[PDB]
């Protein structure tokens, strides 16, 4: 299997409220474990998962330093983007950054990440080669040009290949009683007699972790995506997740429909009928 250590960073300008609100959120798989908030009572990197609470003082001050360093660059960045797009300085704007590594089961690096978006749209991304960029306007080609000239990728690619991996490696091994856990979904189908004379079959999956799951409906071995409504996987709030998928079936032909459930925690995929 594969795992990951991802950092989600946000900087939102606020001309009418003061300097930019800046935050950093760290994750190991679908598990937040660290957070930095500009607007806190005393901004510092804080633990959001008990397995990271086993880190020394150096760890919380080093990350706080790194977060404090980062925010300065983002304030700058925000203003540079203003110039690049010719926009007014009264409008709240956003710069997001996602950086991290997905490593395989052999320990090797499956993929390295380091991208940004400005106002919710892609801006500039470190290709999977971890050497060249990719932009999609003519303002981020300015950024591509700028950074390409400087040799940015090397240092970035050194963090994705080096430190990210070891720290993930350490986090994975130190959070094994949570991170390492696979809870299979409990599944069941409900029956909903519709006013139109037909039935809505609802396939549920509850209590699963990780959040990755696949739910499908079938008709005598036939994937019916036309007829299938599914909701976005959501959290129960306790570390587990939930999801459902529905299909409208003619009343009396229910027997013939099947819900298939694929999850890592399941020995074999489940197949359910009403």
């Amino acid at each position: 299997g594969s795992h990951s250590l991802r950092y989600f960073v946000t900087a939102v300008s606020r001309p009418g409220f003061g300097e930019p609100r800046y935050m950093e959120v760290g994750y190991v798989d679908n598990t937040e474990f660290v957070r930095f908030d500009s607007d806190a009572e005393n901004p510092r990197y804080e633990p959001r998962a008990r397995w990271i609470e086993q880190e020394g003082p150096e760890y919380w001050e080093r990350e706080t330093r790194r977060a404090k360093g980062n925010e300065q660059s983002f304030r700058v960045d925000l203003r540079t983007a203003l110039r690049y797009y010719n926009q007014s300085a009264g409008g709240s704007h956003t710069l997001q950054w996602m950086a991290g590594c997905d490593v395989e089961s052999d320990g090797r690096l499956l993929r390295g990440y380091w991208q940004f978006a400005y106002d919710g749209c892609d801006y500039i991304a470190l290709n999977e080669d971890l050497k060249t960029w990719t932009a999609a306007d003519m303002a981020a080609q300015i950024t591509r040009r700028k950074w390409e000239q400087a040799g940015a990728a090397e240092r970035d690619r050194a963090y994705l290949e080096g430190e990210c991996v070891e720290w993930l490696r350490r986090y994975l091994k130190n959070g094994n009683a949570t991170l390492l856990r696979t809870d299979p979904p409990k599944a069941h189908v409900t029956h909903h007699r519709r006013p139109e004379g037909d039935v809505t079959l609802r396939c549920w999956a509850l209590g699963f972790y990780p959040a990755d799951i696949t739910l499908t409906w079938q008709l005598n071995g036939e994937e019916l995506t036309q007829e299938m409504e599914l909701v976005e996987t959501r959290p129960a709030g306790d570390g587990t997740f939930q999801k459902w998928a529905s299909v409208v079936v003619p009343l009396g032909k229910e027997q013939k429909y099947t819900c298939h459930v694929e999850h890592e925690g399941l020995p074999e995929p489940l197949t359910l009928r009403w």
Partner: peptide, 10 residues
């Protein structure tokens, strides 16, 4: 451990 901007701006 998180990534550093290294003061390389946009």
């Amino acid at each position: 451990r998180g990534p550093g901007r290294a003061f390389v701006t946009i």
